[PDB]
Paper text:
ATP synthase is a unique molecular engine that uses the rotation of its subunits to perform the catalytic reaction of ATP synthesis and hydrolysis. Unlike in mammals, mitochondria of the crustacean [name] have the ability to accumulate large amounts of Ca2+ without undergoing the mPT. Here, we performed structural and functional analysis of [name] ATP synthase to study the molecular mechanism of mPTP inhibition in this organism. We found that the channel formed by the [name] ATP synthase dwells predominantly in its inactive state and is insensitive to Ca2+, in contrast to porcine heart ATP synthase.
Thus, we determined the structure of [name] ATP synthase at pH 8.0 to study if IF1 binding to ATP synthase is also pH-dependent in brine shrimp. [name] mitochondria were solubilized with the non-ionic detergent DDM, followed by ATP synthase purification at pH 8.0. We then obtained maps for states 1, 2, and 3a, among which state 2 was the most prevalent under these conditions. The state 2 map was used for further analysis to generate the F1, FO, and Peripheral Stalk (PS) local refined maps with nominal resolutions of 2.64 Å, 3.39 Å, and 4.01 Å, respectively. The overall structure and subunit composition of [name] ATP synthase at pH 8.0 is similar to the one obtained at pH 7.0. The main difference  is the lack of IF1 in pH 8.0 structure in all rotation states, confirming the pH-dependent binding of IF1 to [name] ATP synthase. In the maps of [name] ATP synthase (state 2, pH 8.0), each non-catalytic nucleotide-binding site in α-subunits is occupied by an ATP molecule with an accompanying Mg2+ ion. The nucleotide-binding sites in the βDP and βE subunits are empty in all the maps. Therefore, the βDP and βE subunits are found in an open conformation in all identified rotational states, while the βTP subunit is in the closed conformation. We find that the overall structure of ATP synthase is more stable at pH 7.0 compared with 8.0.
Author numbering:
A (entry chain R): 2 to 106
B (entry chain N): 4 to 219
C (entry chain 8), I (entry chain 7), J (entry chain 6), K (entry chain 5), L (entry chain 4), M (entry chain 1), ...: 1 to 75
D (entry chain H): 15 to 148
E (entry chain G): 173 to 220
F (entry chain K): 1 to 102
G (entry chain S): 26 to 101
H (entry chain T): 3 to 78
Write the structure that this text describes.
């Protein structure tokens, strides 16, 4: 279902930037000092709607970095092809391992 | 194991995720002036929409987008499926049958319900003799009946043969002998250019045939 | 095992039927060459029917290729 | 909706008239012309031009020889030397012409020029008989 | 302007004109020259 | 703040790998740090046969060669065609604004 | 590719013989970081990277195992 | 690119230490598994001989029975 | 058990008939290219003749394909 | 047993001959498209020839499919 | 006992040579259509060759069908 | 009697070669119709070439028929 | 024995399907000669469409050779 | 006994292959008729091209016949 | 020696693919005749395209002969 998230305020946040998280300013996982990493993990909710929101925000960050600029290249499409081929190899891990060339390795 | 490309029973996360691939490769529009891939995708879609509007007619308002979405679905599964470890959904006869049968039913049943006597006059191709008229009726019935089989087979069997011919060349590509490897890679470059062209041609064939069946 | 041996011979004999599709595709694209060289103002539109001429003939030959799997992985 | 110009030294038949279809008897075979037909040129033969006017009326004109020019703008310029209406033809004179042509063919002997004249008059006689009967 | 057979066969637009062999173009330019000479003769006679 | 549209996308080394991955290691491992990490990773996958060289590896190689040749031959033409279209659209919008003022 | 060879000479060379007392002072500092702290005060970006670096050392170990065993694909 | 950076001496020492350990571990494991492969080939030679003799006898008898059955079907 | 085996051989040899339907379809649509190159305004009736002619030719091929499900099951 | 099996083989091998009838039908209707594109005023007389071609083309198929069933049962 | 099987398979294989006769008949009547569209004045001469062509397009074909009886009952 | 059995089967296969003669004769006489329709002033000279095409095309099929006799009463 | 032997017959009978590739390639390049002779100014675009027809004919023939190699080795 | 039978069968199946040579010879000589009709001033160069085309097609047909005789006698 | 016998049948069945090369060669040189008849001022490029078409069609025929020898002696 399509609607802006409830934290979005068009009279405060300006135009809608879907890659931006409009909620309360939580510490990003990059700069967490790892002594509070369990507290950071417990602070973020594990709801499937929040997970799909974080996936969509990340996918829009990638769109904003590699596709949405005007003179974008074919680097995003090669990234998708390689990312899909690696993921589909990890899915078929057994189907490729069961046809190895060497025994011991 | 040769046919191991066509084994969707892969892991707990199965190979049916090959149908969510077109959601990744569809252009998302944010800015008012489009980017290069959005403009290129829209230009190709507008070109095919203009080509199909000639065959559609004015009484087919829904056929502008219903065949374009089918073209992009078939094209993305045929094109991004040829990359190595990616599962090809349209290789299986189930997906192509799932695309061809419902729209063919939506043509045949709606034509019979809407215009019955016009369809019965349309069975005779305007000039054939009356002794050959029941034969032409049987020919028209059979030719309409094997319409969705000849779409699903022409897509699935072509994709299966197109990837089995690559797998046969890959299995003979030994790594110890560099000469055989270079021959295999060069022949697979020729074969993969042929397979990419066949993939786009077969998606355009399906769009053209669905447009012709929608209009007629 | 006469059944599997005659299934191989049956699939091999049925695979001849794609030769007609190959000849039909060649005649379609040959007459596309002629039609484009005679009236190059309709280069797209002739090509569209030429693509249509690639479709239905191939739908006959690959039908024989369907039996080339049917006698093996279905029967 | 085809601009069909049909003129001659004697008469002018159509001048940019809108015509549905014209059946031209040419040296490359009797072919028909429709709007946006093809950009070909042609050389007329003794035969019958059939003209389909916009009201559905069909008219016929015997043409001896001329030039046919179908252009890119669906414009046709058939220009015979002696184009007549087929209704203004004589069948008996046509049969006499054909009989005299065959007599000249027989009496030509080793005269290749008169042989060519007899062959041409045979073609015209056959076309005139077929147009008068048709 | 009056063009011969070789000046017409070597033209750029003559490739767009169908069913053209040597005999058809030769016969066409012979009659087209005759028609143009007739049209100029009629206009010259009226002008004189 | 208002979102901005950069002219050029993010920097990419070796066709598809992001440049931020290579500059992430510059505090510790220099410039050949990431490259030797990728080299050791590929050697380890081919060593313990986690990545099995199957009939699809040569399909991936042939795709990589074809993709590099096609992109290097047609990337300028396709980017020029696309930027010509975007310029035409932006020109039409600017002409609309000027005509409305007039 | 000559600059890559230059960087390989600068960076892929064995350490200096005189820094052995220094690195032990570093190694015992890691022991001082293995008992007291200096790791629960580590940003996950930095921690990510420190792990990443180490994986590189282990991949150099497997490259050396490939050198010792000869061929790359398995033990032949 | 960027100016080159000298790696940390601990990183270089651990990396080349892991390289040396990898070379000696690869040599030791290859020498260990070579004897195991030789013993496996020794027993597999006898297993291959027994399997080949039994399978060839079974294949020959089954081929004889199949040819007799097909001659019965064809009537020749 | 030779009966089922020879049904498989007969079905495989019966599938060769779809080639000629593929070649006939190729000739029809190739000639549609040539015919449309000289008179595009007639194309609808031209298209109708193709949809007549292909509907006969493919039908002959389907008759042989019907024998692939008539000499295989009912006989 | 072998006779019924070989009757199935002969009927399958006889059913190839409808391919030539399918190709002849395609050539007839293709050239009908070509001929109508030159003189559409002959759209009946050309069509009479096209029907005559089909009335002989499928007759060859009506021999071969007959030579299947006559070989399958009668002979 | 196998002679009956040989006659059935041989007649079934011999009944493919009329496919080429069917394709020749289709080509003759197709080109009759085109040659009548181009030059309809000589219709009674075109038919005067086409039927002759049709006879020579089938005299060979019936010879193959002649073998389909000569292998079947005469030899 | 397997030797005479495959003599019959090999002869039945060798009689498929008459199909190519049938299609070749059809294409020769088809093009004779068109070539007469375009330039009917040299018709008998064109007719002589048609005989020569027939004098080759049927001959090729007759050679396949000859091989049937070589598989029946010569070897 | 029997299953291993009949794979040769299956592969050899599947080899016939590249005849349609040979015929289609010949028809495409023959009509490219005709298209070039008609309109020599478009020889760069005529050759591009003939390569497509050659590729699709090759695709059908290689599919038949794929099935031949499949029956010969992959089973 | 079985080997001589299979040589008979292979010789028949190889002698099938002169069919396409017969079709190519028919296409060459028919197209010579058409080309001479459209341009009778080049009847010596076209006949040379017809001789070259017929020689190459009959070379392919004799290659099939050579393979037939090799499989019948040599191996 | 049943497996060798089936190899000989498979080779005889695999040699029919040269028929498609024979028909493609006939189409190429027949259309070379027509093309040189229409435009005799470009015969070097026409002969270049005819050589390319003959080489590709003969390559498909030799591919069929290569498969007819690969399963005969090598495998
Ligand atoms: C018709 C109109 C268009 C139709 C629709 C097109 C839609 C996409 C348009 C993209 C928009 C854009 O930005 O274009 C401008 C873009 C130019 O952008 P740019 O970055 O400014 O120019 C690049 C320069 O050349 C600068 O680069 P360069 O020339 O200097 O070379 C860069 C690179 C050259 O390499 C490449 O960039 C090409 C490599 C591609 C092969 C990747 C295969 C990976 C498979 C591995 C599997 C395991 O060389 C290197 O630096 C070496 C590294 C090699 C790459 C990595 C190789 C991987 C090997 C394996 C790794 C493990 O031009 C193109 O993209 C032209 C190609 C057209 C697009 C093809 C579509 C590809 C697949 C898309 C997904 C499926 C869609 C289905 C439909 C398919 C078509 C019908
Ligand atoms: C194989 C490569 C083929 C796949 C490449 C795909 C690249 C997509 C990631 C792009 C990215 O990082 O920026 C976008 C964006 C940047 O987000 P951000 O961190 O908030 O941006 C702020 C800055 O960019 C600050 O963040 P940053 O981007 O500057 O952070 C860089 C940092 C990474 O930062 C982190 O702390 C890790 C987070 C990674 C983000 C990506 C997650 C999803 C990746 C999917 C992988 C598919 C395969 O780099 C690393 O530490 C990565 C080293 C990993 C080992 C590789 C060593 C070098 C290999 C050289 C081999 C040559 C021989 O990343 C995302 O969060 C979304 C990623 C897109 C996911 C959906 C599309 C996947 C397409 C398939």
């Amino acid at each position: 279902f399509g609607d802006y998230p409830a934290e979005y305020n068009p009279k405060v946040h300006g135009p809608y930037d879907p890659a931006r998280f409009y909620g309360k300013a939580d510490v990003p996982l990059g700069q967490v000092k790892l002594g509070e990493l369990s507290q950071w993990l417990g602070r973020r909710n594990k709801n499937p709607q929040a997970v799909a929101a974080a996936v969509s925000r990340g996918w829009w960050r990638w769109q904003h970095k590699y596709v949405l600029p005007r003179k974008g290249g074919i680097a995003p499409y090669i990234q998708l092809i390689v990312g899909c081929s690696i993921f589909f190899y990890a899915i078929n891990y057994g189907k490729m391992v069961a046809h190895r060339q060497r025994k011991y390795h | 194991s040769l046919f191991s490309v066509f084994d969707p029973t892969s892991s707990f996360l199965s190979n049916w995720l090959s149908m969510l691939i077109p959601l990744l490769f569809m252009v998302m529009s944010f800015w008012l002036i489009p980017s290069r891939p959005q403009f290129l995708a829209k230009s190709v879609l507008m070109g095919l929409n203009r080509e199909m509007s000639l065959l559609m007619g004015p009484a087919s308002f829904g056929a502008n987008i219903l065949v374009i979405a089918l073209f992009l679905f078939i094209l993305f599964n045929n094109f991004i499926g040829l990359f190595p470890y990616i599962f090809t959904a349209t290789s299986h006869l189930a997906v192509t049958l799932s695309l061809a049968v419902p729209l063919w039913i939506s043509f045949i049943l709606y034509t019979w319900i809407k215009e019955t006597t016009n369809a019965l006059a349309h069975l005779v191709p305007l000039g054939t003799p009356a002794p050959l008229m029941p034969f032409m009726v049987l020919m028209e019935i059979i030719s309409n009946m094997i319409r969705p089989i000849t779409l699903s087979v022409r897509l699935a069997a072509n994709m299966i043969a197109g990837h089995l011919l690559l797998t046969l060349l890959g299995a003979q590509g030994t790594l110890e002998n560099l000469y055989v490897t270079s021959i295999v890679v060069f022949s697979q470059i020729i074969l993969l250019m042929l397979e990419f062209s066949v993939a786009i041609i077969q998606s355009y064939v399906f769009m053209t045939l669905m447009t012709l069946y929608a209009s007629e | 095992d006469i059944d599997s041996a005659a299934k191989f011979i049956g699939a091999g004999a049925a695979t001849v039927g794609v030769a007609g599709s190959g000849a039909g595709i060649g005649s379609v694209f040959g007459s596309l060459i002629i039609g484009y060289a005679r009236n190059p103002s309709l280069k797209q539109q002739l090509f569209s029917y030429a693509i249509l001429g690639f479709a239905l003939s191939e739908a006959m030959g690959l039908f024989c290729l369907m039996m080339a799997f049917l006698l093996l992985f279905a029967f | 909706q085809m601009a069909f110009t049909f003129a001659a030294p004697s008469q002018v038949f159509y001048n940019n008239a809108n015509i549905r279809q014209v059946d031209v008897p040419s040296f490359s075979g009797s072919f028909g012309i429709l709007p946006a037909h093809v950009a070909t040129l042609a050389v007329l033969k003794p035969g019958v031009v059939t003209v389909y006017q916009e009201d559905g009326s069909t008219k016929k004109y015997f043409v001896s020889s001329g030039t046919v020019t179908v252009n890119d703008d669906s414009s046709v310029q058939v220009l015979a030397e002696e184009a007549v209406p087929v209704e203004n033809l004589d069948l008996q004179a046509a049969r006499d012409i054909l009989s005299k042509a065959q007599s000249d063919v027989t009496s030509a002997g080793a005269d290749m020029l008169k042989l060519a004249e007899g062959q041409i008059a045979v073609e015209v006689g056959e076309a005139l008989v077929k147009a008068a009967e048709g | 302007p009056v063009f011969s057979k070789n000046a017409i066969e070597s033209a750029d637009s003559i490739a767009a004109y169908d069913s053209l062999d040597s005999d058809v173009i030769q016969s066409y330019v012979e009659y087209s020259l005759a028609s143009l000479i007739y049209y100029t003769m009629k206009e010259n006679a009226t002008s004189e | 703040p208002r979102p901005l549209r950069p002219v050029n996308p993010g920097k990419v080394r070796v066709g598809f790998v992001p440049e931020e991955w290579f500059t992430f290691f510059y505090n510790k491992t220099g410039v050949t740090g990431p490259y030797v990490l990728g080299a050791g990773a590929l050697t380890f996958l081919l060593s313990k046969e986690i990545y099995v060289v199957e009939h699809e590896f040569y399909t991936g190689v042939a795709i990589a060669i074809m993709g590099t040749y096609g992109v290097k031959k047609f990337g300028k033409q396709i980017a020029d065609y696309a930027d010509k279209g975007i310029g035409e659209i932006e020109q039409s919008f600017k002409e609309y604004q000027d005509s409305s003022k007039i | 590719l000559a600059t890559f060879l230059k960087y390989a000479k600068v960076e892929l060379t064995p350490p200096g013989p005189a820094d052995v007392p220094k690195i032990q002072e570093g190694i015992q500092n890691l022991i001082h970081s293995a008992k007291t702290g200096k790791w629960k005060q580590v940003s996950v970006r930095e921690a990510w990277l420190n792990t990443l670096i180490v994986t590189e050392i282990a991949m150099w170990f497997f490259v050396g195992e490939c050198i010792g065993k000869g061929s790359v694909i398995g033990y032949r | 690119f960027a100016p080159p950076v000298n790696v940390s001496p601990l990183i270089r020492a651990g990396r080349y230490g892991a390289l040396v350990v990898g070379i000696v571990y690869g040599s030791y494991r290859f020498g260990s598994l070579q004897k195991r492969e030789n013993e496996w080939r020794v027993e597999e030679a006898r297993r291959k001989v027994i399997r080949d003799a039994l399978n060839a006898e079974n294949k020959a008898k089954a081929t004889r029975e199949e040819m007799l059955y097909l001659a019965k079907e064809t009537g020749v």
